[PDB]
Design a protein around this motif. Structure first.
Motif, mmCIF file in Angstrom:
data_model
loop_
_atom_site.group_PDB
_atom_site.id
_atom_site.type_symbol
_atom_site.label_atom_id
_atom_site.label_comp_id
_atom_site.label_asym_id
_atom_site.label_seq_id
_atom_site.Cartn_x
_atom_site.Cartn_y
_atom_site.Cartn_z
ATOM 1 N N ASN A 101 4.882 2.426 -7.690
ATOM 2 C CA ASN A 101 4.777 1.561 -6.520
ATOM 3 C C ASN A 101 3.675 2.014 -5.581
ATOM 4 N N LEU A 102 3.057 1.034 -4.938
ATOM 5 C CA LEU A 102 2.085 1.273 -3.896
ATOM 6 C C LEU A 102 2.801 0.728 -2.671
ATOM 7 N N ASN A 171 8.594 -2.930 -1.220
ATOM 8 C CA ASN A 171 7.526 -1.931 -1.106
ATOM 9 C C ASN A 171 6.694 -2.075 0.177
#
Ligand SMILES: C[S@@+](CC[C@H](N)C(=O)[O-])C[C@H]1O[C@@H](n2cnc3c(N)ncnc32)[C@H](O)[C@@H]1O
Ligand SMILES: [Cl-]
Length: 270
Positions: A101-102, A171
């Motif tokens: 994940n970013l 996110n």
């Protein structure tokens, strides 16, 4: 469930070099984004330096381990500096770790700007060593209010389990940074809020596991680790780190604090 926490002042490579392979579950990483004047003796850019601890971090991480790297996307091209993108590109080319994940950390306040959109975000790149990384979503889900939870419970198209457990925080995290009058402030210029670290620790590591931070700064990681039932190893090159760590403790259950890199093992034991 008595946890152990070791801290010390030293260079990140000296810390990592004393840690065995696959011994750490989670690494909290909020690195400096520029090299030192002396670093020019062996490097031609930021990544030339950063790749050394990035490779070492992957080595000490267990098969189920992860590393969360804080950074921005505003690098201006100055020699010796870089940003999270400098790190991500390097990882895509030289590491087998998976970018799970970013994460976008969207904070409320900040400086103004007349010639562009005021900056209100910082990123967190979550790299997992392998596809078997640990993840405890339930531990970080955000519960619905009783009213909304009751509405969803009446909607039979929806899984009632998912409803009671809460929603994925996504996110994009809308959380505040620390202000100059914050209670948890210790003096460090880039001190990160326990709230952000807590989410990372709860979701990316299991109880009793080891959390490592080799750019500890304010020592917030140890504080969070202790409060969450994890073991931890926190080191920073700045001598003042010891004062901050000690301060973190005053903000504080069974746990043991141990000084000295020679005692890292105390926190590696399950
Ligand atoms: C952005 S700060 C970390 C802030 C931390 N996340 C917090 O919440 O306080 C980066 C830290 O890395 C340390 N540092 C810089 N170069 C280092 C090196 N070679 N080895 C270890 N620490 C280093 C600095 O002293 C600083 O405290
Ligand atoms: Cl993503």
């Amino acid at each position: 469930g008595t946890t152990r926490h070791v801290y010390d002042v030293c260079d990140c490579l000296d810390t990592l070099a004393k840690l065995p392979d696959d011994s750490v579950q989670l690494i909290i990483c909020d690195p400096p984004y520029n090299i030192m004047l002396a670093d020019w003796d062996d490097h031609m850019d930021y990544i030339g330096w950063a790749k050394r601890w990035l490779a070492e971090a992957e080595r000490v991480l267990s098969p189920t381990g992860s590393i969360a790297i804080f950074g921005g996307l505003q690098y201006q091209g100055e020699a010796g500096s870089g940003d999270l993108i400098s790190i991500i590109s390097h990882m895509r080319q030289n590491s087998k770790m998976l970018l799970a994940n970013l994460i976008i950390w969207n904070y409320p306040n900040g400086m103004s700007a007349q010639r562009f959109f005021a900056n209100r975000h910082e990123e967190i790149a979550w790299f997992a060593k392998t596809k078997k990384y640990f993840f405890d979503l339930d531990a970080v889900r955000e519960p619905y209010d009783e009213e909304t939870k009751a509405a969803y419970m009446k909607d039979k198209r929806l899984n009632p389990e998912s409803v009671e457990k809460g929603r994925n925080p996504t996110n994009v995290w809308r959380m505040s940074r620390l202000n100059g009058n914050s209670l948890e402030r210790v003096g460090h210029p880039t001190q990160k809020p326990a709230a952000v670290i807590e989410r990372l620790v709860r979701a990316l590591s299991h109880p009793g596991s080891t959390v490592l931070d080799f750019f500890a700064g304010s020592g917030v990681t140890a504080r969070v680790a202790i409060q969450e039932g994890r073991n931890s190893i926190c080191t920073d090159a700045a001598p003042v780190f010891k004062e901050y760590y000690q301060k973190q403790l005053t903000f504080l259950r069974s746990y043991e604090i141990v000084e000295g890199a020679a005692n890292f093992g105390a926190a590696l034991q399950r």
